Design a protein around this ligand. Sequence first.
Ligand code: CLA
Ligand SMILES: CC1=C[C@H](O)CC(C)(C)[C@H]1/C=C/C(C)=C/C=C/C(C)=C/C=C/C=C(C)/C=C/C=C(C)/C=C/C1=C(C)C[C@H](O)CC1(C)C
Lengths: 217, 212, 230, 205
Amino acid sequence: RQSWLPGSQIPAHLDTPAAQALAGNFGFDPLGLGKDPVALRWYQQAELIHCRTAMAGVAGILIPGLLTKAGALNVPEWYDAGKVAIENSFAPWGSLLAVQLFLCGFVEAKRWQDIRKPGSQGEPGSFLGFEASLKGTSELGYPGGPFDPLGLSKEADKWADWKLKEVKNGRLAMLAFLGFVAQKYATGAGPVDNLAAHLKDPWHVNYATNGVSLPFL
Amino acid sequence: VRPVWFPGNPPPAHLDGSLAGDYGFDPLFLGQEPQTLKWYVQAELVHGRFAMLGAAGIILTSIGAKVGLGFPEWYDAGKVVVEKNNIDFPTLMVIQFYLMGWAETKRWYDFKNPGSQADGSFLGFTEEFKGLENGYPGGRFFDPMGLSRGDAAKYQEYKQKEVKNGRLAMIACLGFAAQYAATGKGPLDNLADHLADPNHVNFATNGVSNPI
Amino acid sequence: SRPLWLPGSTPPAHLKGDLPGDFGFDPLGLGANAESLKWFKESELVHSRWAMAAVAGILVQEIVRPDVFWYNAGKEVESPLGPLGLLAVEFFLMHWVEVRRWQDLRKPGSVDQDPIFSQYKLPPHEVGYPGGVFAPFIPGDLAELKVKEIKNGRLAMLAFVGFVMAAQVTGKGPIAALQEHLADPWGTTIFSKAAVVPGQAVAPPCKIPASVSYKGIEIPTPCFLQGLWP
Amino acid sequence: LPSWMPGADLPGYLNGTLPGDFGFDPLYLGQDPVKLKWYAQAELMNARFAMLAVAGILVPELLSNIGFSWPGAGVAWYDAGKFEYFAPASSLFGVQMLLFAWVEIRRYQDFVKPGSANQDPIFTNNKLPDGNEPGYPGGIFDPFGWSKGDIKSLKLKEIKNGRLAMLAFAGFIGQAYTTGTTPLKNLSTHLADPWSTTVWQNDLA
Ligand code: CLA
Ligand SMILES: CC1=C[C@H](O)CC(C)(C)[C@H]1/C=C/C(C)=C/C=C/C(C)=C/C=C/C=C(C)/C=C/C=C(C)/C=C/C1=C(C)C[C@H](O)CC1(C)C
């Protein structure tokens, strides 16, 4: 098997049939958090949700960020998108935050009750009729039905590969967003401009020169 | 009997003579545990290799410096190489830590698990990162000419020569350091100065070595 | 055991007499591994052949067209061909040839067939000695001519390094240096130019200049191992 | 038995059934057979669009230097987006995506279930023959009576011209980004002076 550190002793809780059947297992647990299988279950759920929302957010940063260097899509910088949006908008930000709290709390409550009980949300008479297709698909965190419309999740031969691509791209996306934050506080411009200013002069413009990222040198 | 570092004293129990450069020199008994002695074997070899390479650098640069070529002396080369080309100091140091950390970490985790890096995790390489002994990582990359797998007794001779030259180089580099701290001049300049007047230019004349 | 270098001595245990022109010369033991020894065998053959062709080039180049300093010749012969174009042709062509030969080395008996014309096939051989169209005929016998080629090769390699230093100290060609030396044998040797004493050390001045301005972008020209001359 | 490197070991999963199987995969991209199928179909499609593209960049420019008078007088291949048509490019994009959605999803439905998209939905008499071969349709897509010969030769030829055309279109992108000119003019100034117009020559400016 692959390991993060070849030659390192892989911990015994990440070496089970239950833990090796997880997407993107690389035996990485230096701080031994996942000693409890229930806790490992919950943490896997946390990783999946963070992956999906991280991909969505970072794509939202990049793709308008890239395409604005072309002609179309005049988009302001991601750290200024809220202001301009709310000046474009019709309501104050408080009411928008309240509405999103409601509409997201409902859904997250659903998903949470499905985490505590696996076959929960599908029981007769609960919803007006989507109770038909709100069960799980035998692997928690990966529902079916109205999710996965295109039927890509039906074939069994591509299954682990779709999983593994998801988790790898997601981990990379989380790293990307943390990078967005740090580059915002460090240099003071958009990430696309950081990429351009680094490709323009690599040996002079990096975090060894920005004067904040390591002040002792 | 083996030649001992001190003719007459028997050698300690943990030192036998299977190693290279084994003269029974351990008054503080720092290597009594076998794992600790194994680790110190690797430490001595690594320090010796960097010392040999460094002293060769110092001597060759000073030879080029005394003859009128324009090389700086070794206490000035860092400043003039960083200053003169364009090079930013910290990015060079950081890349040093990148590469050295990668390779050195490979070495560390090959010590902990002795045959682990020969699995194929690195790009595609198998049995060219398997170690031969403790601190002798001979494969295709580290023994390209192929001296370790032929003429085994002559190879033991090479081990002996490596350790002896390494120790000599370590105390040589210490010599360069303290010599520059005392006289404030270049090392081969000191060699020519002592070679001009041996009876009157030595350490007993600087006034810094013996303050009596 | 035929003769050997430093006769009367004993050869190393790995050199026996299979190869042409082996005399037991390995004090460092650089041929203990057979898998090394094959690569080094090919290395010796190739270096010898390049050196022979280059030494004959230098001699005949001086003879036919004198007063063209071979050590400068690149700054010379420049033609309507661009140097970039020459570098390109050399790169691609030599890349092809060396790759084919090396493929024959690491995988024997594979590149014997002409790729374009599928009729011709190079016959079986011993590595490093292809034969076929590479040698139309043998004057004499094989096992002697192998010895002769290795001898002329080692002599030629020494001759070329002699040419390089003989240019970087004097500043003339080989035959011109020979004329200078026959003009005064006691006064023009390497011992007659430089010496080291515990008092002082003196070296010959380098005749060859600094960075050479070929086409604006200058080529830095150093002499080999400048600081350790006598 | 041909190779991309005569003597070197070929990967085991390639067996010549694919057109143009030369055993070239130094990155081992096609170990799984499913990925091999998808990659093969992708190669065919990329090849055909490359061949049509390179034809559509050579032929207008080749017929530009000869001097006809249709309003495509040699403007460019990359300046095809600043010309007055008889429709702005937006509706062009719309109709394009509708028609190609129809065609490409139909083709994908053939690929997932081979032998299922054969008959004409409207005029239900017209039907493709049962030589399905996902990626090689047949029937009216081979209207002029070919495929009579040993088609492995013609498949091999199609894939060779496709690979050459893909590299050619990569060439058009690279040359037009670097020199910023038309490609037959690049061949013109290269046939003018082959020794002082090279890549190494131009990249030193
Ligand atoms: C291109 C260089 C080269 C190479 C690779 C070889 C290779 C070989 N020679 Mg060889 N040889 C050469 C040049 C070379 N020769 C020259 C120039 C001479 C004349 C002096 C000889 C004379 C010679 C004899 C008399 C014999 C060999 C033998 C051998 C074989 C076994 C020895 C061995 O393992 O060495 C491997 C060689 C190397 C690893 C190359 C070492 C290069 C070092 C590291 C560079 C340092 C050299 C130093 C700068 C000194 C330079 C000289 C100076 C005057 C300029 C081997 C195939 C023996 C043989 O045939 O047995 C099979 C044998 O009997 N050679
Ligand atoms: C593994 C482990 C294990 C062992 O045991 C221990 C240790 C080691 C400690 C650990 C580690 C950990 C880590 C590292 C983690 C990380 C994380 C992250 C980074 C996340 C993020 C994450 C991230 C995320 C989600 C993100 C998201 C984002 C978003 C939404 C965005 C949004 C937006 C947009 C669109 C645009 C607009 O205009 C604005 C805004 C609003 C801004």
